Design a binder for this molecule. Structure first.
Ligand SMILES: Nc1nc2c(ncn2[C@@H]2O[C@H](COP(=O)(O)OP(=O)(O)NP(=O)(O)O)[C@@H](O)[C@H]2O)c(=O)[nH]1
Lengths: 50, 104, 113, 308
């Protein structure tokens, strides 16, 4: 309830699209990769950004 | 009048719509299931492009459905004593039962 | 050879005004278009400087409908009346093409300066 | 005979080599949108009265820029002179050039349009909306002349498919800028003509691919300030192409320019009921029907479909 309540208050009258709530207020990302060459670009090193 | 009612008028003209629909049922009788169709269309008209033969169908699909209906899955029968080549995955045969001829 | 329009139609006479039932008896130059779904008035042309409302009864008589006119369109016509500063109007709800036939016929077979 | 070429080259670029056969017209095979009291439709007719000249750059190699001079009657000549001299100010008008020339013993009037393109937009719309892989030459010429693809790409079989070879999307996506520029120039022409008091109907077989306009032979004049563009056939025919060549993708950029990063919209914004109105006002200004973005306000089903 911290991040969600913080970000809803930023809206015009508390209405935001659903497709962004897990994009900002989710604490666990899960990435699925088909093959090594595709793994190279995204999940490089031990930490990555997205 | 088709061009008139298409790109000039603004509201529906029931008289012309009924006229065109009667024409369509006169020269383009259809029988429709859920995307599987059979058409008994006039020949001497379609030969000179007054009812769509097959290439108008191909062009319409190409520009309004974003697919390409290749002309290898589209049958065409030049005779009528044998029914449609394939409808609902049932070939049609003309047979003599009882005393008359029926389609099975 | 996309043409504006051939075989157009012509005028009727009806009352107009600036507010509600301002129809004295008849003050306008309505332009008819006798469609098979009823006679369709098209345009207006009055020497009165502005008007807002006009009213032409239907084919039943009991049904008289009030119509709402354009802002002014001003020009002069050279006719047996000599100099004639007229003011032309249409009916709102009118698409561009109807202005097309009305103006095309008026400028093709009538005189203006 | 030969003085005709030098006369056609008025004040610019005498590098012309006629594609016809001298001082006679050439027959071409293009599309039209004709409706005059007898016959309507939208199909491929046969044009006959066009003496076509081609301009070529230095090293004397051909380049896409033509001189389409047309011969017709006398009344059309003076009517076009009046209307063109009225509409000369607008930037979106192909620079006409009039003269009177003799052939055998007749003082035949000429009209000399300048710097046009090979294929007018009607040809693009037709040849893309009436596809037939057995006979598609105009589409290939248009696609290879504008650096979209190269002629070696047309050997990869099933090149026109949308299921297999999905790269045809990117191939078609190279005409978007041209289409958008043409739309903007049409808007400019509509504004200029409405200001200059002219009345007529626009057509797809006038605006060549660059954007220039011509053929004022059907318009008539009125008092300035009360002109009107009849535009229903134009957009109603160009509509299915606008989302196949993706001409609106140039708007998802910070300055309407394909050399800049995408606009970073705020995530929380969801209304978006003003950008749609702005775009519809800038591109489709004269489309004569109310457009309400929020489809809830629509009157009845027909308007719902038209706004969707
Ligand atoms: N610009 C251009 N037009 C070409 C060419 N080949 C054929 N055309 C066609 O030839 C015509 C030239 O323009 P024009 O004749 O003035 O158009 P129009 O609508 O037929 N004139 P009008 O309305 O008076 O009958 C157009 O229809 C155009 O599509 C070409 O190489 N360049």
């Amino acid at each position: 309830n911290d991040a969600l309540n913080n970000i809803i208050n930023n809206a015009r009258d508390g209405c935001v699209p659903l497709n962004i709530i897990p994009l900002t207020t989710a604490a666990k990302l899960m990435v699925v990769i088909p093959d090594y060459n595709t793994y190279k670009n995204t999940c490089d090193g031990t930490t990555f950004t997205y | 009048r088709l061009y008139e009612c298409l790109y000039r008028n603004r509201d529906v003209d029931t008289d012309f719509v009924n006229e065109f629909y009667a024409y369509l049922r006169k020269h383009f009788s259809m029988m429709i299931l859920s995307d599987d169709a059979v058409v008994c269309f006039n020949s001497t008209y379609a030969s000179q492009g007054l009812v769509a033969s097959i290439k108008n169908f191909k062009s319409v699909l190409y520009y309004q459905n974003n697919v390409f209906m290749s002309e290898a899955k589209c049958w065409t029968e030049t005779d009528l004593t044998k029914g449609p080549h394939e409808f609902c995955s049932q070939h049609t045969m003309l047979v003599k039962q009882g005393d008359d001829y029926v389609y099975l | 050879n996309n043409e504006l329009s051939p075989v157009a139609l012509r005028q009727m006479s009806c009352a107009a005004g600036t507010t509600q039932t301002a129809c004295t008896d008849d003050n306008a130059l309505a332009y008819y278009n006798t469609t098979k779904g009823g006679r369709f008035v098209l345009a207006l042309l009055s020497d009165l400087q502005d008007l807002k409302w006009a009213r032409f009864p239907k084919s039943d008589g009991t049904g008289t409908i009030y119509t709402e006119l354009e802002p002014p369109c001003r020009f002069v016509t050279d006719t047996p009346k000599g100099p004639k500063v007229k003011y032309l109007y249409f009916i709102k709800g009118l698409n561009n093409l109807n202005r097309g036939m009305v103006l095309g016929s008026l400028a093709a077979t009538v005189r203006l300066q | 005979a030969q003085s005709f070429l030098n006369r056609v080259c008025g004040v610019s670029a005498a590098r012309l080599t006629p594609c016809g056969t001298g001082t006679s017209t050439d027959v071409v095979y293009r599309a039209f949108d004709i409706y005059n009291d007898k016959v309507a439709g939208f199909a491929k007719f046969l044009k006959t009265n066009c003496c076509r000249f081609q301009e070529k750059d230095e090293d004397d190699n051909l380049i896409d820029s033509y001189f389409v001079v047309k011969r017709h009657t006398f009344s059309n000549y003076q009517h076009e002179e009046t209307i063109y001299n009225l509409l000369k100010d607008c930037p979106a008008v192909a620079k006409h050039d009039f003269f009177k020339f003799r052939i055998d013993g007749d003082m035949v009037p000429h009209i000399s349009r300048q710097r046009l393109t090979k294929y007018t937009m009607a040809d693009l719309v037709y040849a893309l909306r009436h596809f037939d892989e057995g006979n598609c030459d105009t589409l290939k010429e248009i696609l290879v002349t504008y650096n979209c693809c190269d002629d070696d790409y047309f050997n990869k079989k099933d090149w026109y498919d949308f299921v297999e070879n999905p790269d045809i999307l990117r191939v078609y996506a190279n005409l978007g800028e041209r289409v958008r520029q043409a739309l903007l120039k049409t808007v400019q022409f509509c504004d200029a003509m409405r200001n200059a008091g002219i009345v007529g109907v626009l057509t797809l077989d006038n605006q060549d691919l660059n954007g220039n306009w011509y053929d004022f032979g059907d318009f008539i004049q009125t008092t300035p300030g009360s002109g009107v563009p009849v535009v229903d056939s134009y957009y109603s025919l160009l509509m299915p192409i606008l989302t196949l060549t993706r001409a609106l993708t140039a708007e998802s950029h910070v300055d309407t320019d394909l050399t800049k990063p995408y606009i970073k919209w705020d995530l929380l914004k969801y209304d978006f009921t003003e950008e749609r109105l702005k775009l519809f006002d800038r591109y489709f200004k004269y489309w004569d029907q109310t457009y309400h973005p929020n489809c809830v306000n629509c009157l009845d089903d027909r308007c719902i479909l038209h706004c969707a």
